[PDB]
Amino acid sequence: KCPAVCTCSKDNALCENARSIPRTVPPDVISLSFVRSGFTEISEGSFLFTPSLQLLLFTSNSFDVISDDAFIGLPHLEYLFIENNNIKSISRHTFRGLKSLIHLSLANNNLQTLPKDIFKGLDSLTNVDLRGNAFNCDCKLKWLVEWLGHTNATVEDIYCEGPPEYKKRKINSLSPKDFDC
Numbered sequence: 001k002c003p004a005v006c007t008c009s010k011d012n013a014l015c016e017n018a019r020s021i022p023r024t025v026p027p028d029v030i031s032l033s034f035v036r037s038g039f040t041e042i043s044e045g046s047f048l049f050t051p052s053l054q055l056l057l058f059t060s061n062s063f064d065v066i067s068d069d070a071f072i073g074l075p076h077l078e079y080l081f082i083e084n085n086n087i088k089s090i091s092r093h094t095f096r097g098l099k100s101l102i103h104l105s106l107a108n109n110n111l112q113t114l115p116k117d118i119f120k121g122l123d124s125l126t127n128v129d130l131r132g133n134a135f136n137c138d139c140k141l142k143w144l145v146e147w148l149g150h151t152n153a154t155v156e157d158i159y160c161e162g163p164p165e166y167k168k169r170k171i172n173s174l175s176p177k178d179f180d181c
């Protein structure tokens with residue numbers, strides 16, 4: 001019942017160098033991890049067949065895009081860890097539909113921006129980790145300051161990698177005037 005690419009513990013499944021997201025994952029596996037995966041993107045509805053996941057981890061992957069509604073069909077997911085990845089693009093609705101998500105980690109992916117309203121609709125979120133990314137502070141990030149001010153979640157300090165004028169400045173400290181636009 002455990003997928004061939006993955007090795008499965010009782011409640012946990014680890015998939016390494018998987019060429020596709022398995023749709024056969026046994027129920028009563030609440031945690032799934034993808035390490036050094038073969039697949040280059042996460043399309044919409046990839047996890048539809050694994051509704052029981054409370055925890056998801058992506059690490060050491062190279063992704064062209066993580067699509068809108070990629071995580072649709074995961075009503076029970078509390079923890080989502082996307083870390084130490086190469087991600088070229090992240091869609092505004094990528095995380096749409098996770099109401100139960102408590103902890104979200106984008107940390108250490110070297111992401112240059114984030115789209116507006118990417119955190120829209122995640123109510124249960126107590127923690128977001130944006131550290132370890134190279135953020136270009138510009139018009140596309142201007143929303144992020146407003147979100148950091150009004151957010152209920154705990155977010156540790158993050159800094160602008162660019163442009164040269166703003167480098168190594170706390171994004172939380174910035175004001176909307178400084179963003180140009």
Ligand SMILES: *[C@@H]1O[C@H](CO)[C@@H](O)[C@H](O)[C@H]1NC(C)=O
Nearest residue numbers: 146147148149150151152153
């Ligand atoms: C943070 O949460 C409290 C209670 O959960 C709420 O009253 C407050 O308005 C929230 N902050 C916002 C929405 O900026």
